[PDB]
Amino acid sequence: DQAGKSPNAVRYHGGDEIILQGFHWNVVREAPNDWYNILRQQAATIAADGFSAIWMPVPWRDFSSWSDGSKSGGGEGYFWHDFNKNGRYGSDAQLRQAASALGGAGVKVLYDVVPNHMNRGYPDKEINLPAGQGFWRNDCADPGNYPNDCDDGDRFIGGDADLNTGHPQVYGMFRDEFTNLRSQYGAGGFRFGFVRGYAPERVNSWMTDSADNSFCVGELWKGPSEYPNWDWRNTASWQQIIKDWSDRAKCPVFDFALKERMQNGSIADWKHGLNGNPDPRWREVAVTFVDNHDTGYSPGQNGGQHHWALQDGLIRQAYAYILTSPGTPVVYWDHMYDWGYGDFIRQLIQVRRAAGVRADSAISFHSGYSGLVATVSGSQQTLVVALNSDLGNPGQVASGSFSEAVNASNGQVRVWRS
Ligand SMILES: OC[C@H]1O[C@H](O[C@H]2[C@H](O)[C@@H](O)[C@@H](O[C@H]3[C@H](O)[C@@H](O)[C@@H](O[C@H]4[C@H](O)[C@@H](O)[C@@H](O)O[C@@H]4CO)O[C@@H]3CO)O[C@@H]2CO)[C@H](O)[C@@H](O)[C@@H]1O
Ligand SMILES: [Ca+2]
Ligand SMILES: [Ca+2]
């Protein structure tokens, strides 16, 4: 494991990580209070599969509950009331045992953190911030969903649970808990959620104070059409918007530009994600993914959230693309361990490592064929990747001598290495 910051000081931890999203939406309902025991038990496997890091669920306890007729949810971590670690995924002691086993197997533990809001109304919680002290967004006039005096980012729904993350006491609180996660729970980095809710610069401060040389990734899911008409972003590309956030927070960013193309464009169009950017400074900060607990399905209740899921017909193509390309890839728990894409992903992880593909490796796209044809310059080998393509052999598009590395999905997924 390579451990530094990028040339622009972005915290991509060497640019060589391969992350597993360590949970699905329905885990708290499917294996109540047992998740950490399960992960503890799977540690050796996760490490054997080739993952360098695991994205853990929010460790802060969440006893929330909601019902929207058919749909219902709560307890997943995103509506926490406390920093207490005895929540729906397991106890404090089990968490420590899981983190210790993962770390012991050499898998860095990244914690999902939600600074934007908290379960304000929760009757019994250890964190009680009164009103009238500027601790809350609604302590100030709130015209709509844009920054106000008590909150420099968007709000979550009504904004009534939004914290003034910039308040010295709120900043501090989070800052000490991050430090806590690092010293007592083996945290190797963080996943910042709902980054549109507070300033980018604040994530950099938190990273600076608590875990400067660690890995971080921020979730910025906000289209151009969501910015005011006068904002440069209202007319920017998805790439530009996420790139900008990355620049300010000094953290890699989830590639929603790639996700958007996978959903709305054809496969040839996948070259328009951040990870396909010709400028190394742009592609090395992209954290690529096929689906997460928000966009994808999950085993169990309601099929999970499935807000923007990739149809089954592009799953193998999608994993072949992120696993062989620039940016830092993330594998969703379910595709790996529930749905049987495990052996296929294991092979692609081995191909990526053997070719020495990393965050900044170059990528060149070929246009004389159907599908997506790309040449990836790994530090150890060159790969030719052909997805849903009429390409016949690697020599038609690359110089050198190639061997087959992967041939799946009836020739729809083909990978060759020099
Ligand atoms: O008091 C604040 C608000 O409280 C009530 O809001 C409810 C929402 O209506 C529910 O839909 C739900 O929200 C979920 C959300 O649906 C779910 O997707 C998840 O979101 C995370 C996301 O997974 C994650 O990746 C991340 O980065 O950010 C998202 C936001 O944290 O979790 C949410 C929280 O459980 O629950 C809330 C709270 O129960 C109320 O209806 C509102 O009117 C009120 O403003
Ligand atoms: Ca690394
Ligand atoms: Ca906010």
From Swiss-Prot:
One of its GO terms (molecular function) is alpha-amylase activity. Ca(2+) 1 binds at D1, Q2, H13, D16, E17. Substrate binds at Y78, F79, H117, F156, I157, G158, G159, D160, R191, R196, G197, H293, Q305. Its cofactor is Ca(2+). The record marks D294 as: Transition state stabilizer. Disulfide bonds join C140-C150, C216-C251. Its main location: secreted. GO terms for cellular component: extracellular region. One of its GO terms (biological process) is starch catabolic process. Ca(2+) 2 binds at N116, D151, D154, D162, G197. Keywords: Calcium, Carbohydrate metabolism, Disulfide bond, Glycosidase, Hydrolase, Metal-binding, Secreted, Signal. There are several isoenzyme forms of this protein. Monomer. This is Glucan 1,4-alpha-maltotetraohydrolase. The gene is amyP. The chain holds residues 22 to 439 of 548 of the full protein.
